Amino acid sequence: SKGEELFTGVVPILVELDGDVNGHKFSVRGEGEGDATNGKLTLKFICTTGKLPVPWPTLVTTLVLCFARYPDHMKQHDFFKSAMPEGYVQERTISFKDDGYYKTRAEVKFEGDTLVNRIELKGIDFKEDGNILGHKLEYNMNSHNAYITADKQKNGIKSNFKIRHNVEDGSVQLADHYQQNTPIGDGPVLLPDNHYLSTQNKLSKDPNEKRDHMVLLEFVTAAGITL
């Protein structure tokens, strides 16, 4: 794709999320960089409105799949870069089992030389004293695979995948994601054969940051189409 040429080096990233969870309004700003060569993302996120009123791990998937590393033989299946620089809309419903759900609408596009992910998030039906509003999730990560399928009727891609959040009592809190992406521009995009994205990541803290925050490292690699 023409868009893939924008990803041969490390690219600065800006993430802006405005959220409303059960009427709790909050904002997150993230800044860092991504390299599709190795699939590596390094970002730091800050809640700019005070304490984050949901658990940081539940926002990881919402807070830039154009930085996934597509192997050479899979380059023709990289929808996300093909839509650049004009970008794409990424929409999700994220349903937390036995709890509420997030609805997210994001635009991922270049604004100058920076790849920007701007998200509006709405959460409803979260339970008082549940794992989300009660912050009962461990500050940690499970590696995942997310399967990507073409959505030709929308000139885009869909994905359904479950995230497993560890709860403080040793249970697991599933977050079932339904995702759709559509190009912002009118130019040609690559509609992929079925494949998946594999993630390995790491959530940490900046010992000198006083605000509520999350330091994130995430590798994303495309797989599932062989020679």
PDB file of C-alpha atoms in Angstrom:
ATOM      1  CA  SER A   1       0.000   0.000   0.000  1.00  0.00           C
ATOM      2  CA  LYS A   2       1.032   3.644  -0.300  1.00  0.00           C
ATOM      3  CA  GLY A   3       0.186   4.037   3.380  1.00  0.00           C
ATOM      4  CA  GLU A   4       2.743   1.462   4.516  1.00  0.00           C
ATOM      5  CA  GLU A   5       5.586   3.782   3.489  1.00  0.00           C
ATOM      6  CA  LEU A   6       4.600   6.085   6.388  1.00  0.00           C
ATOM      7  CA  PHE A   7       5.569   3.338   8.854  1.00  0.00           C
ATOM      8  CA  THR A   8       9.157   2.438   7.970  1.00  0.00           C
ATOM      9  CA  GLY A   9      10.469   4.270  11.051  1.00  0.00           C
ATOM     10  CA  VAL A  10       9.475   5.257  14.549  1.00  0.00           C
ATOM     11  CA  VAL A  11       6.449   7.583  14.468  1.00  0.00           C
ATOM     12  CA  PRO A  12       5.252   9.884  17.287  1.00  0.00           C
ATOM     13  CA  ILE A  13       1.816   9.068  18.705  1.00  0.00           C
ATOM     14  CA  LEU A  14      -0.785  11.221  20.475  1.00  0.00           C
ATOM     15  CA  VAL A  15      -3.780   9.599  22.169  1.00  0.00           C
ATOM     16  CA  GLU A  16      -6.722  11.639  23.453  1.00  0.00           C
ATOM     17  CA  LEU A  17      -9.613   9.896  25.175  1.00  0.00           C
ATOM     18  CA  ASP A  18     -12.662  11.597  26.650  1.00  0.00           C
ATOM     19  CA  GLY A  19     -14.856   9.251  28.648  1.00  0.00           C
ATOM     20  CA  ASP A  20     -18.189   9.092  30.419  1.00  0.00           C
ATOM     21  CA  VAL A  21     -18.716   5.948  32.522  1.00  0.00           C
ATOM     22  CA  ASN A  22     -22.005   5.947  34.421  1.00  0.00           C
ATOM     23  CA  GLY A  23     -21.899   9.760  34.150  1.00  0.00           C
ATOM     24  CA  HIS A  24     -18.338   9.867  35.540  1.00  0.00           C
ATOM     25  CA  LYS A  25     -16.504  12.210  33.159  1.00  0.00           C
ATOM     26  CA  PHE A  26     -12.769  11.781  32.667  1.00  0.00           C
ATOM     27  CA  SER A  27     -10.004  12.389  30.156  1.00  0.00           C
ATOM     28  CA  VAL A  28      -6.777  10.608  29.304  1.00  0.00           C
ATOM     29  CA  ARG A  29      -3.833  11.936  27.310  1.00  0.00           C
ATOM     30  CA  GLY A  30      -1.113   9.642  26.009  1.00  0.00           C
ATOM     31  CA  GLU A  31       2.110  10.387  24.202  1.00  0.00           C
ATOM     32  CA  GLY A  32       4.825   8.135  22.896  1.00  0.00           C
ATOM     33  CA  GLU A  33       5.834   6.447  19.687  1.00  0.00           C
ATOM     34  CA  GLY A  34       5.360   3.357  17.585  1.00  0.00           C
ATOM     35  CA  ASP A  35       7.441   1.337  15.172  1.00  0.00           C
ATOM     36  CA  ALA A  36       5.716  -1.044  12.786  1.00  0.00           C
ATOM     37  CA  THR A  37       9.135  -2.532  11.914  1.00  0.00           C
ATOM     38  CA  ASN A  38       9.098  -4.515  15.168  1.00  0.00           C
ATOM     39  CA  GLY A  39       5.493  -3.826  16.180  1.00  0.00           C
ATOM     40  CA  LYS A  40       6.623  -1.922  19.272  1.00  0.00           C
ATOM     41  CA  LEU A  41       4.561   0.745  21.027  1.00  0.00           C
ATOM     42  CA  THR A  42       5.891   2.786  23.962  1.00  0.00           C
ATOM     43  CA  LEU A  43       3.487   5.254  25.545  1.00  0.00           C
ATOM     44  CA  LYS A  44       2.697   6.986  28.802  1.00  0.00           C
ATOM     45  CA  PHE A  45      -0.907   7.862  29.617  1.00  0.00           C
ATOM     46  CA  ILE A  46      -2.129  10.370  32.186  1.00  0.00           C
ATOM     47  CA  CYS A  47      -5.622  10.876  33.554  1.00  0.00           C
ATOM     48  CA  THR A  48      -5.863  14.649  33.263  1.00  0.00           C
ATOM     49  CA  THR A  49      -9.054  14.936  35.320  1.00  0.00           C
ATOM     50  CA  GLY A  50      -7.854  13.284  38.541  1.00  0.00           C
ATOM     51  CA  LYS A  51      -8.101   9.609  39.427  1.00  0.00           C
ATOM     52  CA  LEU A  52      -9.078   7.342  36.548  1.00  0.00           C
ATOM     53  CA  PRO A  53     -12.600   6.164  37.510  1.00  0.00           C
ATOM     54  CA  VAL A  54     -12.173   2.770  35.804  1.00  0.00           C
ATOM     55  CA  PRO A  55      -9.144   0.398  35.919  1.00  0.00           C
ATOM     56  CA  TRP A  56      -6.262   1.316  33.605  1.00  0.00           C
ATOM     57  CA  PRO A  57      -6.057  -2.241  32.171  1.00  0.00           C
ATOM     58  CA  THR A  58      -9.607  -1.964  30.846  1.00  0.00           C
ATOM     59  CA  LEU A  59      -8.590   0.947  28.577  1.00  0.00           C
ATOM     60  CA  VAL A  60      -5.531  -0.670  26.946  1.00  0.00           C
ATOM     61  CA  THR A  61      -7.360  -1.962  23.884  1.00  0.00           C
ATOM     62  CA  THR A  62      -9.116   1.389  23.379  1.00  0.00           C
ATOM     63  CA  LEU A  63      -5.988   3.535  23.820  1.00  0.00           C
ATOM     64  CA  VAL A  64      -3.305   2.010  16.989  1.00  0.00           C
ATOM     65  CA  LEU A  65      -3.263  -1.216  14.974  1.00  0.00           C
ATOM     66  CA  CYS A  66      -1.513   0.519  12.065  1.00  0.00           C
ATOM     67  CA  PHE A  67       1.667  -0.145  14.114  1.00  0.00           C
ATOM     68  CA  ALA A  68       1.256  -3.921  14.010  1.00  0.00           C
ATOM     69  CA  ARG A  69       4.152  -5.697  12.336  1.00  0.00           C
ATOM     70  CA  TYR A  70       2.897  -7.427   9.206  1.00  0.00           C
ATOM     71  CA  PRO A  71       5.397  -9.999   7.883  1.00  0.00           C
ATOM     72  CA  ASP A  72       6.545  -9.398   4.316  1.00  0.00           C
ATOM     73  CA  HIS A  73       4.336 -12.158   2.939  1.00  0.00           C
ATOM     74  CA  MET A  74       1.255 -10.647   4.651  1.00  0.00           C
ATOM     75  CA  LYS A  75       1.743  -7.011   3.580  1.00  0.00           C
ATOM     76  CA  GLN A  76      -1.189  -7.258   1.160  1.00  0.00           C
ATOM     77  CA  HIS A  77      -3.503  -7.920   4.142  1.00  0.00           C
ATOM     78  CA  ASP A  78      -2.666  -4.786   6.190  1.00  0.00           C
ATOM     79  CA  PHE A  79      -5.873  -2.773   6.080  1.00  0.00           C
ATOM     80  CA  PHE A  80      -4.735  -0.422   8.810  1.00  0.00           C
ATOM     81  CA  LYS A  81      -1.721   1.070   7.016  1.00  0.00           C
ATOM     82  CA  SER A  82      -3.492   1.052   3.647  1.00  0.00           C
ATOM     83  CA  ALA A  83      -6.055   3.530   5.009  1.00  0.00           C
ATOM     84  CA  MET A  84      -3.333   5.997   5.997  1.00  0.00           C
ATOM     85  CA  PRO A  85      -2.680   8.861   6.062  1.00  0.00           C
ATOM     86  CA  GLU A  86      -6.376   9.744   5.897  1.00  0.00           C
ATOM     87  CA  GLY A  87      -6.989   7.106   8.555  1.00  0.00           C
ATOM     88  CA  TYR A  88      -9.898   5.045   9.746  1.00  0.00           C
ATOM     89  CA  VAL A  89     -12.742   5.037  12.222  1.00  0.00           C
ATOM     90  CA  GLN A  90     -12.480   2.322  14.866  1.00  0.00           C
ATOM     91  CA  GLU A  91     -15.661   1.516  16.797  1.00  0.00           C
ATOM     92  CA  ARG A  92     -16.119  -1.022  19.570  1.00  0.00           C
ATOM     93  CA  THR A  93     -18.551  -2.388  22.071  1.00  0.00           C
ATOM     94  CA  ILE A  94     -16.691  -3.895  25.048  1.00  0.00           C
ATOM     95  CA  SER A  95     -18.960  -5.957  27.309  1.00  0.00           C
ATOM     96  CA  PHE A  96     -17.656  -6.830  30.769  1.00  0.00           C
ATOM     97  CA  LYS A  97     -19.171 -10.107  31.898  1.00  0.00           C
ATOM     98  CA  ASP A  98     -21.651  -9.621  34.755  1.00  0.00           C
ATOM     99  CA  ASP A  99     -21.083  -5.852  34.538  1.00  0.00           C
ATOM    100  CA  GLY A 100     -21.513  -2.875  32.214  1.00  0.00           C
ATOM    101  CA  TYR A 101     -20.170  -2.088  28.769  1.00  0.00           C
ATOM    102  CA  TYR A 102     -18.102   0.499  26.945  1.00  0.00           C
ATOM    103  CA  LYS A 103     -19.042   1.948  23.566  1.00  0.00           C
ATOM    104  CA  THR A 104     -16.094   3.592  21.838  1.00  0.00           C
ATOM    105  CA  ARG A 105     -15.707   5.645  18.672  1.00  0.00           C
ATOM    106  CA  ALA A 106     -12.219   6.595  17.593  1.00  0.00           C
ATOM    107  CA  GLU A 107     -10.463   8.155  14.653  1.00  0.00           C
ATOM    108  CA  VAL A 108      -6.911   7.063  13.902  1.00  0.00           C
ATOM    109  CA  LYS A 109      -5.135   9.300  11.403  1.00  0.00           C
ATOM    110  CA  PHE A 110      -2.090  11.452  10.804  1.00  0.00           C
ATOM    111  CA  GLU A 111      -2.293  15.044  12.058  1.00  0.00           C
ATOM    112  CA  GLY A 112       0.934  16.380  10.631  1.00  0.00           C
ATOM    113  CA  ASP A 113       3.761  13.943  11.336  1.00  0.00           C
ATOM    114  CA  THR A 114       1.972  12.467  14.380  1.00  0.00           C
ATOM    115  CA  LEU A 115      -0.311   9.451  14.372  1.00  0.00           C
ATOM    116  CA  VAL A 116      -3.301  10.465  16.473  1.00  0.00           C
ATOM    117  CA  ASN A 117      -5.896   8.223  18.116  1.00  0.00           C
ATOM    118  CA  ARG A 118      -8.816  10.349  19.330  1.00  0.00           C
ATOM    119  CA  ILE A 119     -11.513   8.437  21.204  1.00  0.00           C
ATOM    120  CA  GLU A 120     -14.923   9.148  22.708  1.00  0.00           C
ATOM    121  CA  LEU A 121     -15.870   6.467  25.236  1.00  0.00           C
ATOM    122  CA  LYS A 122     -19.252   5.922  26.900  1.00  0.00           C
ATOM    123  CA  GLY A 123     -19.776   3.337  29.626  1.00  0.00           C
ATOM    124  CA  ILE A 124     -23.155   2.375  31.011  1.00  0.00           C
ATOM    125  CA  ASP A 125     -24.707  -0.077  33.451  1.00  0.00           C
ATOM    126  CA  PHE A 126     -21.576  -0.546  35.567  1.00  0.00           C
ATOM    127  CA  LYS A 127     -22.266  -2.007  38.976  1.00  0.00           C
ATOM    128  CA  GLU A 128     -21.597  -0.341  42.261  1.00  0.00           C
ATOM    129  CA  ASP A 129     -18.860  -2.294  44.028  1.00  0.00           C
ATOM    130  CA  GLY A 130     -18.115  -4.243  40.841  1.00  0.00           C
ATOM    131  CA  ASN A 131     -14.655  -4.890  39.448  1.00  0.00           C
ATOM    132  CA  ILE A 132     -14.705  -1.813  37.219  1.00  0.00           C
ATOM    133  CA  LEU A 133     -16.094   1.009  39.366  1.00  0.00           C
ATOM    134  CA  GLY A 134     -14.541  -0.649  42.426  1.00  0.00           C
ATOM    135  CA  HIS A 135     -11.080  -0.963  40.874  1.00  0.00           C
ATOM    136  CA  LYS A 136     -10.757  -4.665  41.679  1.00  0.00           C
ATOM    137  CA  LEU A 137      -8.613  -5.571  38.674  1.00  0.00           C
ATOM    138  CA  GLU A 138      -4.931  -6.359  38.970  1.00  0.00           C
ATOM    139  CA  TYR A 139      -2.540  -3.983  37.243  1.00  0.00           C
ATOM    140  CA  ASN A 140      -1.266  -6.560  34.770  1.00  0.00           C
ATOM    141  CA  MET A 141      -1.763  -7.968  31.272  1.00  0.00           C
ATOM    142  CA  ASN A 142      -2.532 -11.210  29.499  1.00  0.00           C
ATOM    143  CA  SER A 143      -1.120 -11.762  25.998  1.00  0.00           C
ATOM    144  CA  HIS A 144      -3.912 -12.152  23.458  1.00  0.00           C
ATOM    145  CA  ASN A 145      -4.742 -12.959  19.842  1.00  0.00           C
ATOM    146  CA  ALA A 146      -7.383 -10.935  17.952  1.00  0.00           C
ATOM    147  CA  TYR A 147      -8.769 -12.341  14.681  1.00  0.00           C
ATOM    148  CA  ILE A 148      -9.339  -9.914  11.798  1.00  0.00           C
ATOM    149  CA  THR A 149     -11.871 -10.487   9.023  1.00  0.00           C
ATOM    150  CA  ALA A 150     -12.782  -8.401   5.992  1.00  0.00           C
ATOM    151  CA  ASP A 151     -16.098  -6.537   6.043  1.00  0.00           C
ATOM    152  CA  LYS A 152     -16.568  -5.972   2.319  1.00  0.00           C
ATOM    153  CA  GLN A 153     -20.052  -4.462   2.685  1.00  0.00           C
ATOM    154  CA  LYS A 154     -18.414  -1.601   4.633  1.00  0.00           C
ATOM    155  CA  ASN A 155     -15.038  -1.540   2.808  1.00  0.00           C
ATOM    156  CA  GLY A 156     -13.386  -2.299   6.132  1.00  0.00           C
ATOM    157  CA  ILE A 157     -12.545  -4.923   8.705  1.00  0.00           C
ATOM    158  CA  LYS A 158     -14.348  -6.544  11.815  1.00  0.00           C
ATOM    159  CA  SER A 159     -12.896  -8.315  14.809  1.00  0.00           C
ATOM    160  CA  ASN A 160     -14.393 -10.060  17.841  1.00  0.00           C
ATOM    161  CA  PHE A 161     -12.090 -11.055  20.695  1.00  0.00           C
ATOM    162  CA  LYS A 162     -12.141 -11.562  24.465  1.00  0.00           C
ATOM    163  CA  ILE A 163      -9.703  -9.919  26.890  1.00  0.00           C
ATOM    164  CA  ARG A 164      -9.072 -11.720  30.203  1.00  0.00           C
ATOM    165  CA  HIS A 165      -8.606  -9.271  33.089  1.00  0.00           C
ATOM    166  CA  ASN A 166      -7.277 -10.757  36.311  1.00  0.00           C
ATOM    167  CA  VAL A 167      -9.342  -9.887  39.387  1.00  0.00           C
ATOM    168  CA  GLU A 168      -7.785  -9.333  42.790  1.00  0.00           C
ATOM    169  CA  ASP A 169      -9.467 -12.463  44.223  1.00  0.00           C
ATOM    170  CA  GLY A 170      -7.989 -14.762  41.570  1.00  0.00           C
ATOM    171  CA  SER A 171     -11.077 -14.792  39.347  1.00  0.00           C
ATOM    172  CA  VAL A 172     -11.055 -13.506  35.776  1.00  0.00           C
ATOM    173  CA  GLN A 173     -13.196 -10.678  34.333  1.00  0.00           C
ATOM    174  CA  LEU A 174     -13.855 -11.185  30.607  1.00  0.00           C
ATOM    175  CA  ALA A 175     -14.230  -8.174  28.314  1.00  0.00           C
ATOM    176  CA  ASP A 176     -15.866  -9.220  25.036  1.00  0.00           C
ATOM    177  CA  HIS A 177     -14.884  -6.838  22.228  1.00  0.00           C
ATOM    178  CA  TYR A 178     -16.849  -6.340  18.996  1.00  0.00           C
ATOM    179  CA  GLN A 179     -14.893  -4.040  16.672  1.00  0.00           C
ATOM    180  CA  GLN A 180     -15.457  -2.504  13.269  1.00  0.00           C
ATOM    181  CA  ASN A 181     -13.135  -0.279  11.254  1.00  0.00           C
ATOM    182  CA  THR A 182     -13.891   1.797   8.163  1.00  0.00           C
ATOM    183  CA  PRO A 183     -11.631   4.076   6.103  1.00  0.00           C
ATOM    184  CA  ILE A 184     -12.008   7.833   6.409  1.00  0.00           C
ATOM    185  CA  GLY A 185     -10.757   8.505   2.880  1.00  0.00           C
ATOM    186  CA  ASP A 186     -12.074   7.361  -0.479  1.00  0.00           C
ATOM    187  CA  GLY A 187      -8.849   5.847  -1.826  1.00  0.00           C
ATOM    188  CA  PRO A 188      -8.360   2.122  -2.240  1.00  0.00           C
ATOM    189  CA  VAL A 189      -7.740   0.020   0.861  1.00  0.00           C
ATOM    190  CA  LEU A 190      -6.573  -3.554   1.372  1.00  0.00           C
ATOM    191  CA  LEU A 191      -9.329  -5.938   2.498  1.00  0.00           C
ATOM    192  CA  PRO A 192      -7.542  -8.829   4.177  1.00  0.00           C
ATOM    193  CA  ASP A 193      -7.862 -12.531   4.157  1.00  0.00           C
ATOM    194  CA  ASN A 194      -8.554 -13.903   7.611  1.00  0.00           C
ATOM    195  CA  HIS A 195      -5.591 -13.570   9.984  1.00  0.00           C
ATOM    196  CA  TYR A 196      -4.900 -12.497  13.541  1.00  0.00           C
ATOM    197  CA  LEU A 197      -2.880 -10.021  15.579  1.00  0.00           C
ATOM    198  CA  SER A 198      -0.871 -11.276  18.561  1.00  0.00           C
ATOM    199  CA  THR A 199      -0.042  -8.972  21.478  1.00  0.00           C
ATOM    200  CA  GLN A 200       2.577  -9.050  24.225  1.00  0.00           C
ATOM    201  CA  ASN A 201       2.639  -6.092  26.578  1.00  0.00           C
ATOM    202  CA  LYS A 202       3.718  -4.649  29.916  1.00  0.00           C
ATOM    203  CA  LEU A 203       1.977  -2.148  32.228  1.00  0.00           C
ATOM    204  CA  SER A 204       4.207  -0.169  34.572  1.00  0.00           C
ATOM    205  CA  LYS A 205       4.505   3.071  36.526  1.00  0.00           C
ATOM    206  CA  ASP A 206       6.795   6.083  36.250  1.00  0.00           C
ATOM    207  CA  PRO A 207       8.235   6.475  39.773  1.00  0.00           C
ATOM    208  CA  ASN A 208       8.384  10.258  39.361  1.00  0.00           C
ATOM    209  CA  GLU A 209       4.813  10.760  38.079  1.00  0.00           C
ATOM    210  CA  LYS A 210       2.382  12.020  40.722  1.00  0.00           C
ATOM    211  CA  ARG A 211      -0.725  11.901  38.526  1.00  0.00           C
ATOM    212  CA  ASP A 212      -2.738   8.741  37.965  1.00  0.00           C
ATOM    213  CA  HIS A 213      -1.072   7.191  34.953  1.00  0.00           C
ATOM    214  CA  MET A 214      -0.026   4.106  33.005  1.00  0.00           C
ATOM    215  CA  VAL A 215       3.235   3.390  31.212  1.00  0.00           C
ATOM    216  CA  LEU A 216       2.608   0.897  28.420  1.00  0.00           C
ATOM    217  CA  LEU A 217       4.829  -1.256  26.224  1.00  0.00           C
ATOM    218  CA  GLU A 218       2.953  -3.285  23.609  1.00  0.00           C
ATOM    219  CA  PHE A 219       4.194  -5.537  20.787  1.00  0.00           C
ATOM    220  CA  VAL A 220       1.641  -6.348  18.087  1.00  0.00           C
ATOM    221  CA  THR A 221       2.447  -8.892  15.353  1.00  0.00           C
ATOM    222  CA  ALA A 222       0.259 -10.122  12.505  1.00  0.00           C
ATOM    223  CA  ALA A 223       0.164 -13.874  11.971  1.00  0.00           C
ATOM    224  CA  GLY A 224      -1.913 -16.706  10.594  1.00  0.00           C
ATOM    225  CA  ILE A 225      -1.157 -16.603   6.849  1.00  0.00           C
ATOM    226  CA  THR A 226       1.763 -18.846   5.901  1.00  0.00           C
ATOM    227  CA  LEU A 227       3.981 -19.441   2.886  1.00  0.00           C
TER     228      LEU A 227
END
